[PDB]
Paper text:
Central to these functions, [name] promotes the annealing of complementary single-stranded DNA ([name])8,9 and provides an alternative to BRCA2/RAD51-dependent homologous recombination repair. Our studies provide structural snapshots throughout the annealing process and define the molecular mechanism of [name] annealing by the [name]–[name] complex.
To determine the validity of this hypothesis, the structure of the [name]-OR bound to [name] (2.3 Å) was solved. An analysis of the [name]–[name] complex revealed that the DBD was stabilized as [name] bound into the positively charged groove on the outside of the [name] ring. In the [name]-OR–[name] complex, the [name] could be visualized from the second to the seventh [name] subunit. There were four [name] nucleotides per [name] subunit, consistent with the observed four-nucleotide pattern of hypersensitivity to hydroxyl radicals. Arg153 coordinated the phosphate backbone of the two central nucleotides, whereas Arg55 and Lys152 coordinated the phosphate backbone between two quartet stacks. The Mg2+, which is required for [name]–[name] interactions, and the surrounding water molecules were coordinated by Glu145, Asp149 and Glu140 residues from the neighbouring subunit. In agreement, using focused 3D classification analysis, we found a subclass of [name]–[name] particles that exhibited a low-resolution density across the site of ring opening corresponding to the C-terminal domain of [name].
Author numbering:
A (entry chain G): 26 to 54, 62 to 167
B (entry chain F): 26 to 57, 61 to 176, 186 to 204
C (entry chain H): 36 to 48, 65 to 162
D (entry chain E): 25 to 57, 61 to 179, 186 to 204
E (entry chain D): 25 to 57, 61 to 204
F (entry chain C): 25 to 178
G (entry chain B): 25 to 56, 61 to 176
H (entry chain A): 33 to 43, 65 to 166
The structure:
Amino acid sequence: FGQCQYTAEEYQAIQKALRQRLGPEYISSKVCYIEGHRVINLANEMFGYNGWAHSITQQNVDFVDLNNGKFYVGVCAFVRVQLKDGSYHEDVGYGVSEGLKSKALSLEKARKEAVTDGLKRALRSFGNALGNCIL
Amino acid sequence: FGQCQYTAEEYQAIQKALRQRLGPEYISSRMAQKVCYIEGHRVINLANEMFGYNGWAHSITQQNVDFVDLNNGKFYVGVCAFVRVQLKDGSYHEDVGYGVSEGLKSKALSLEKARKEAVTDGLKRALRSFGNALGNCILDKDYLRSLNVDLTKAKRQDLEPSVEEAR
Amino acid sequence: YQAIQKALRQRLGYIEGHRVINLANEMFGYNGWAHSITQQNVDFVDLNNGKFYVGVCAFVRVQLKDGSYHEDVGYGVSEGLKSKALSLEKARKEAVTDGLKRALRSFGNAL
Amino acid sequence: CFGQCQYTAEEYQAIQKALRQRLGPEYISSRMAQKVCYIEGHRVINLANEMFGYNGWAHSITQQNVDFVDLNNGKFYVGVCAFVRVQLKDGSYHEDVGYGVSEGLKSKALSLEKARKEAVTDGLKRALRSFGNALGNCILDKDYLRSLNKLPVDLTKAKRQDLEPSVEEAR
Amino acid sequence: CFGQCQYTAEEYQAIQKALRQRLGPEYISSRMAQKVCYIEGHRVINLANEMFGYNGWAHSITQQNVDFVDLNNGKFYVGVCAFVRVQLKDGSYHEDVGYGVSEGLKSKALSLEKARKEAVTDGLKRALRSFGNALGNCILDKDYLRSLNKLPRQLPLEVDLTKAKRQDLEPSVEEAR
Amino acid sequence: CFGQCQYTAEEYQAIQKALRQRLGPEYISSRMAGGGQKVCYIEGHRVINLANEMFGYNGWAHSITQQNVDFVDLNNGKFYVGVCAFVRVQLKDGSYHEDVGYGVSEGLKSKALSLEKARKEAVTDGLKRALRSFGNALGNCILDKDYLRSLNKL
Amino acid sequence: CFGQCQYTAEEYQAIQKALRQRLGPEYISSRMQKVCYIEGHRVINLANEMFGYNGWAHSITQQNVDFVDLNNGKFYVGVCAFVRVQLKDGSYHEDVGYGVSEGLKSKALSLEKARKEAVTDGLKRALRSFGNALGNCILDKDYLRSLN
Amino acid sequence: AEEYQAIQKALYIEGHRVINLANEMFGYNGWAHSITQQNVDFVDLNNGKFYVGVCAFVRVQLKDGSYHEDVGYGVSEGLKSKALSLEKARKEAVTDGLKRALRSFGNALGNCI
Amino acid sequence: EGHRVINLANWAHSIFVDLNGKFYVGVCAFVRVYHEDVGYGVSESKALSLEKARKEAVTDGLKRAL
DNA sequence: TTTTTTTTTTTTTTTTTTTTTTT
Ligand SMILES: [Mg+2]
Ligand SMILES: [Mg+2]
Ligand SMILES: [Mg+2]
Ligand SMILES: [Mg+2]
Ligand SMILES: [Mg+2]
């Protein structure tokens, strides 16, 4: 994982298979998007369960404001996605929590949402099959 | 570890096994409405079965304490954690976990509970990203809508003849 | 081999982010280019009349597996929007996309 | 060598089967907390030794940190955290967090000592747990615990002297 | 060399069955802390030397930190902690933490003396404890302890110095080389 | 070479048998440092000589990994110093031990002399304590209460 | 080459015999209570006698200036050095050497004295661990009583 | 082999004479030296004049592999300029270090007193 | 523009404030490929200033390489 | 448009004097 050069057959299969646009079954709504678990499944079925890897380069908390007993949070996450050949795409994601009477729950929701969103938006750069044809 | 290449047959067997879902014997529900989840120890068992006791590793990249607050003698704690899971070939997935303690009068107990819960939650979320077999199917609405021990062999002696003879 | 050197000069018909990504995925391949974020800086956040105004910078680096790379800059704004989280989200993402757009243009006319 | 020597098929299979097994009622201790069931750390040490051998596993402390030392009414309240890594002869590893605690002592050094020891012990226990049910992972299953609840040392050959004739012969 | 030499089958089996043993009542010391039981450090070193040999193990110190050096009524209170790593010829290892405590002394150099030596001693003792019952792991068991307290009290003995070394030269070792 | 040369069976057996011995009554010195109690010990040069005989002039080595001054203090014009060192002893095959030695200097009115004494004493104390883990022949037998109680009634 | 040349049985036995010898009165100095020692050149020549001109080496690992204090226009300096001696086989020893300069109003002279003295003190204290023929005997209280 | 016994039996002082001695004792291609560490002690440009102190570590190594490391030292005073003063201290320190390094080999190359 | 250099070369390039209503910012702009030659850039909205900074320094940087 | 159950007791006394001239 880091120096496993692709073979020609698999290279062409991947290159052709990524351009296929996503059928109406996957998309759900206004804004049309893709659920995160569907994106994970598509990645697994596309590269293999051992063909891609993701990590968190860094994560920041932007603010925690309390207004009338409710907390408002915003979290930035840098999520990096790597392939077994050595290619990667890093992208940013954001998470928001509002109206929760608990600060810890708000932080948890925000951080996890930010990570999931960064993961979604990092895979799109690879091809249309994973979501680039959504806007 | 870290440089062990999968064989074609093991590759295919794991690829087929990860692709499948979990029966109603792995999912439990708690009031929150209701939420369906998979317990951490069951996920550890499934990971062991899928990859083997020596097929996967997990590490804590970094933890941090978000806040400790005292209100009327009660401590409120929130702890984050980064957990990284790895496979023999090199592949890995890193995810975040969070722990919470609410109404404990002892700060040390609150920190302990929060940190341990954070590590467990992070591991659970990091194992999810490998397939449906490891918990990735419980957040799908369609599957959720669709769904809705003998101790004779229990170890009683320390010595393990089979392992020692095989050693 | 030697085809890209001549396939970069051609132009055809502002450019949307998805389209430049799609053209990026074609000349080099899904495994021929990578990009990364080097820095982000929330230059300012202001509140007026219950509406927030944000401006964010971003450093985006794009490398071909041959080795060559070009780091460039991008900016993002979010004016007249209640709530801070949406503002910051929009600004950061637009900054990253803009930096990516401007980074890729340095390799030739085609992009 | 350690960290670069592979398993064989037979040993590997035997260890899987052994690790899958659960633990009996004589490995389980109970304490008030309305009870709570657990496995003592030295028992886990013994199980790991006889599951992988005395030279089959290695543990280390990768980080320790004191969270707070507080004095109240002449008594110290301390809390410590430890990251313990357990590694196997092939290269596999599991890293978990342990946490120690001391409260009510009038001596600062004793509190730090107790907490810093408890941290590493607890972390080792929790890092060995994720290798199988045999190494304590079965204690977290409520069905197992309610199944155990529905159930019904005279070694005169102890080491008396210092030498090991057989070990010396083999060496 | 050390860390790159592997055990043979017979050697491994012998050490494995030996480390399983539990120590007798003549290794066990007692002190008031209710009474508590322990194994003294030099005995542990002797046991390790017998088990693995003088060239079969190796221990080091990875870090040492002073937690505090306080003064109260002219008397110093010190606390130190050490990370002691024990290793074997094949490559295996075990680490643990030892703590040294010193209190009551008017001198400050002596306080650090005692704390910093006690810490390394405790750390080595606990790092060797995780190799078997033979290197002290049995003392933690309540059943094994309540068994010993039921055994007869052995009277103290006196060692014989007729075999004690009295000359620097070692003719056997010299001939061996 | 040093650090990768293997002991033969006869040498291993000989050295193993020798290190198990307990030193006789002429190696034990004494002091009065218990406020009413006596303490036994072994001198440094004697331990170096014992090591040289046991392993040979080219069978062992030692080094200093780190040294640090805990404090240099002044009171009534007098200097108080405390220095600590970590000493590593190695054998021809690769085995090693490390322990801590500490030096003290209370009373002198010169800063340089105090530091000199503290540092040198700490290094020697460390070399003594590291060699102690190789066996009784190198001073491990002193800690025994029974062994000393036998010497004190000779 | 150096660091990887082994000793024959005869050479090792010969050196082992020699290093056990104690030192006669022609090597021991004295000063004012009374002290005894061995000069630097004496130990250097002894080492050249045992191991030969190409049979030993030494180097400096750490030299740190403990202080440079100035009082009454007079400097007080202190330098601590760590010196390492190794043989052709590969064996080595390391110990701490010290240098003290006091009373000299010239800063450079005090620094030079301390720096140069520390290396030689450490070199003497390093060679001592090889055997009695290189100064290890001087610590023997009984030996001094016999010679004195 | 005979060369070893010959050299061993063969084995203030003006500078270049010691370099000539080393050249004769071991030969033009039998020895080498190099500078390892350099340092400067104290302040400069005091009362118009300068005080410069430089200490150097020099390592002399023979063809077989033997070597010795010793410490030099350099002092510059009186000269009222930074230029070519610290350089003079550097040169003096290097030379003193080389002389003290060649000394430990034997009497033919030093050993004062 | 970069067209002249990209045609001739085939090169890669790596990378304060004033702030009311008027802006000017630094550059931090480098260039590589042969060895590197660095320059600096000037500006004249923060986005416009930073972008213009990056233009000119690259322009100057490329000249020095030539 | 993500996502929302975990945590289960441990710790067991040690330390035992050295150093002292050179460029
Ligand atoms: Mg203790
Ligand atoms: Mg002492
Ligand atoms: Mg001196
Ligand atoms: Mg939760
Ligand atoms: Mg607990």
